[PDB]
């Protein structure tokens, strides 16, 4: 199969679009489905038209409480090398 | 019972120290890689020419290690400054910056310590189960235009209410939740009620 | 360094692993270039589309909305921007094409024209565009009647000021 | 004649000047040549790699 | 005699390649901060009112 990233051997080119799994490049990704290795154009997401008009409004009637995590590196290992003994 | 952003730092630093250790076994164009085997079977005038190539190679190894540590410490400092700013603005206060403290309307945050980092637990409010309604900018009554004080005018199909904009809680339109400004002939979309 | 010659290539082995480090460094900076784009543009879950009949209270977004008869389905102003700006060496392509990034910006732009700021906090909830403009006026401390009584003037000023970006570029 | 290299030679659409014997581009790599018997100029392209 | 002359080229070319790779790290660390600011402006000016 000929991509714009190069020539790809050993993967079948399907026609459906999934989320990206292993990035090949120039818009192509690969994944292990079903049992074989397939290559496809990635999808950006599901489509959605909003019911816009000039006198319509959507107002929520309930809510959820969400808790999510965020991880950040603060520090690293302090190392010294004696330049002469090295 | 995830942490790859912390394991990446550990792995990159070990991978640099391993390369520095392993460059101690290259000849760099000398007869031996070990200095004692040049010293034992050579005399000073010709030991020197072989020792100088080892010195040249090992100095360059060490300099590459130190430059790449300086570039990586500057990336760790930006991360730690961002984490300090999140600790001040997400744990010691309530933020209005969108997406700064999680997805949704920030309510609060809790810190937790990690091996070389920090984990923030963000509590947010996420609105749910939206319904459709008809809206109007203003109401017309007695030849006057009425605007909501804090909310929106909504219709369930037959009746008009005021509600707050994030939670549906309909109330009667009175002179206590509206204010007046002008005639009902200038604003585009007035309805009569 | 050697250019396919076994004499130079054998001498090079005496230098250890300098050339595995250089490749590791360049690979590490070529992966973060795609990470850079992913975090600016993939800020939506859905790809939102704008309605076919476009009445936004007098405001006119036609020079920044996508154009089907154009290359890569870009907006009119995204085109002016794309027109203004051997031996062991290769250039790798980016993971997102330019078509994909123009798709991402048109989904952001249709989300904001149509739902205000609600789609960045949850599900998109539609609101008429002038009522959204009135909420934004409230957010800077002006009352809402000042927008509703000056709607046509505010819309004309906005249209005439979007028309000047296009000239200056 | 002494110009030594390796690659794949194709026929070209350049036009040298009668005294000019080979061409080179920016970065000064040889990308054309004249062969000294046909008096025809040939494009030089590196042999695929990756 | 060609070993001594090939090593002089090897040393120079290694130096030049490694200078190229250092200056790219320093330039990428600057592009990274610009993209981090662009990601914050997309959140705070496009999906909100600042
Ligand atoms: C508000 O009303 C609109 C328009 O009536 C609804 O939009 C529908 O969206 C679906 C998408 O699955 C379309 O197939 C329909 O044609 C649309 N119109 C309908 C059902 O009349 C929208 O779903 C409504 N919103 C809510 C929250 O109920
Ligand atoms: C819109 O809301 C109004 C008020 O909530 C509804 O009118 C009331 O409906 C109840 C139904 O049990 C009656 O008992 C009341 O007498 C009605 N009038 C009032 C309270 O003043 C109306 O039915 C709603 N319309 C729709 C289409 O749902
Ligand atoms: C909002 O849009 C609706 C429909 O696009 C407008 O209703 C039209 O109003 C004009 C003049 O008022 C009529 O000539 C059309 O026949 C109406 N359309 C339909 C389908 O009935 C409405 O005027 C717009 N403005 C608002 C509601 O302020
Ligand atoms: C809302 O009610 C007002 C009256 O309170 C209506 O105003 C009348 O409009 C007609 C037609 O435009 C005029 O001929 C009358 O002179 C108006 N009377 C007054 C007292 O202003 C208005 O038309 C109504 N509009 C709707 C949409 O119901
Ligand atoms: C929004 O503005 C554009 C101008 O950029 C209008 O489109 C052009 O209008 C002129 C004047 O009639 C025409 O000559 C062009 O053919 C139009 N199309 C272009 C330039 O692509 C557009 O009509 C405006 N939208 C509304 C609803 O008025
Ligand atoms: C090199 O010599 C050969 C002959 O040894 C020439 O070949 C002739 O070329 C002409 C074209 O100009 C043909 O019509 C003849 O049939 C060729 N003869 C033979 C025997 O090959 C060639 O032209 C010479 N080229 C130069 C540049 O001197
Ligand atoms: C993919 O879809 C295109 C539709 O244009 C079709 O021509 C092609 O044969 C399809 N390929 C496969 C493997 O189904």
XYZ file of N, CA and C in Angstrom, chain A residues 17-76:
180
model
N -13.010 4.658 9.258
C -12.147 5.578 9.980
C -12.344 5.385 11.470
N -11.283 5.032 12.163
C -11.300 4.936 13.610
C -10.454 6.047 14.213
N -10.445 6.101 15.534
C -9.478 6.919 16.239
C -8.075 6.413 15.942
N -7.094 7.300 16.032
C -5.740 6.884 15.710
C -5.193 5.979 16.803
N -4.511 4.909 16.386
C -3.945 3.942 17.321
C -2.424 3.956 17.266
N -1.819 3.682 16.119
C -0.392 3.866 15.901
C -0.237 4.844 14.749
N 0.416 5.978 14.941
C 0.518 6.954 13.860
C 1.515 6.525 12.805
N 1.039 6.428 11.576
C 1.901 6.205 10.425
C 2.378 7.522 9.845
N 1.467 8.445 9.614
C 1.841 9.769 9.159
C 0.955 10.211 8.025
N 0.997 11.505 7.735
C 0.216 12.134 6.674
C -1.250 11.727 6.707
N -1.785 11.468 7.888
C -3.189 11.180 8.053
C -3.529 9.723 8.204
N -2.554 8.819 8.127
C -2.798 7.384 8.162
C -2.334 6.845 9.501
N -3.102 5.907 10.046
C -2.822 5.186 11.277
C -3.031 3.691 11.039
N -2.517 2.880 11.957
C -2.643 1.431 11.863
C -3.155 0.842 13.172
N -3.736 -0.351 13.101
C -4.259 -1.010 14.294
C -4.478 -2.510 14.100
N -4.451 -3.244 15.207
C -4.652 -4.688 15.194
C -6.126 -4.998 15.430
N -6.843 -5.320 14.359
C -8.267 -5.618 14.457
C -8.573 -7.110 14.346
N -9.754 -7.431 13.825
C -10.171 -8.818 13.660
C -10.867 -9.021 12.316
N -6.195 -10.095 14.749
C -6.524 -11.053 13.711
C -5.879 -10.622 12.397
N -5.528 -9.339 12.314
C -4.768 -8.800 11.192
C -4.359 -7.366 11.505
N -3.530 -6.760 10.657
C -3.081 -5.384 10.832
C -3.666 -4.540 9.716
N -4.400 -3.497 10.086
C -5.125 -2.675 9.129
C -4.619 -1.243 9.198
N -4.759 -0.542 8.077
C -4.315 0.831 7.926
C -5.447 1.679 7.369
N -5.667 2.846 7.973
C -6.856 3.640 7.685
C -6.545 5.116 7.877
N -7.372 5.954 7.262
C -7.398 7.374 7.578
C -8.075 7.596 8.922
N -7.431 8.369 9.789
C -7.985 8.602 11.111
C -9.260 9.426 11.022
N -10.096 9.305 12.041
C -11.282 10.134 12.155
C -11.073 11.171 13.243
N -11.602 12.362 13.008
C -11.468 13.436 13.978
C -12.508 13.353 15.076
N -13.669 12.799 14.779
C -14.713 12.653 15.767
C -16.043 12.494 15.073
N -17.072 12.309 15.886
C -18.415 12.149 15.359
C -19.006 13.497 14.989
N -19.815 13.508 13.941
C -20.371 14.760 13.465
C -21.614 15.148 14.248
N -21.941 16.432 14.195
C -22.942 17.007 15.072
C -23.417 18.322 14.480
N -24.688 18.380 14.128
C -25.334 19.637 13.799
C -26.111 20.104 15.014
N -25.957 21.362 15.348
C -26.649 21.969 16.472
C -27.925 22.591 15.944
N -29.029 22.371 16.651
C -30.333 22.824 16.191
C -30.469 24.331 16.398
N -29.633 25.079 15.690
C -29.659 26.524 15.808
C -30.864 27.108 15.092
N -31.575 27.990 15.784
C -32.507 28.923 15.174
C -32.489 30.202 15.993
N -33.247 31.190 15.556
C -33.173 32.499 16.179
C -34.172 32.712 17.307
N -34.922 31.696 17.724
C -35.684 31.837 18.953
C -35.723 30.542 19.750
N -34.703 29.708 19.631
C -34.626 28.451 20.351
C -33.475 28.473 21.342
N -33.686 27.872 22.504
C -32.650 27.803 23.523
C -32.712 26.455 24.218
N -31.559 25.945 24.620
C -31.459 24.692 25.350
C -30.973 24.969 26.760
N -31.724 24.497 27.746
C -31.416 24.766 29.146
C -31.350 23.462 29.927
N -30.301 23.232 30.706
C -30.149 21.947 31.382
C -31.019 21.824 32.620
N -31.479 20.608 32.863
C -32.370 20.329 33.973
C -31.719 19.515 35.075
N -30.460 19.129 34.928
C -29.784 18.315 35.918
C -28.298 18.611 35.810
N -27.496 17.942 36.621
C -26.058 18.140 36.559
C -25.377 16.872 37.033
N -24.089 16.786 36.760
C -23.222 15.781 37.346
C -22.044 16.461 38.026
N -21.549 15.826 39.077
C -20.283 16.184 39.701
C -19.206 15.304 39.093
N -18.168 15.925 38.552
C -17.067 15.214 37.929
C -15.783 15.427 38.715
N -14.976 14.377 38.822
C -13.646 14.460 39.412
C -12.654 13.865 38.432
N -11.635 14.635 38.072
C -10.605 14.149 37.161
C -9.223 14.462 37.701
N -8.231 13.733 37.217
C -6.867 13.871 37.700
C -5.982 14.603 36.701
N -4.922 15.194 37.223
C -3.922 15.864 36.409
C -2.566 15.669 37.058
N -1.583 15.224 36.290
C -0.298 14.793 36.824
C 0.803 15.692 36.287
N 1.707 16.125 37.170
C 2.760 17.052 36.765
C 4.104 16.722 37.397
N 5.167 16.620 36.600
C 6.508 16.459 37.169
C 7.040 17.737 37.797
N 7.563 17.599 39.005
C 8.083 18.726 39.745
C 9.601 18.733 39.803
N 10.239 17.576 39.781
C 11.616 17.448 40.219
C 12.271 16.328 39.435
N 13.595 16.316 39.430
C 14.293 15.151 38.902
C 15.443 14.751 39.810
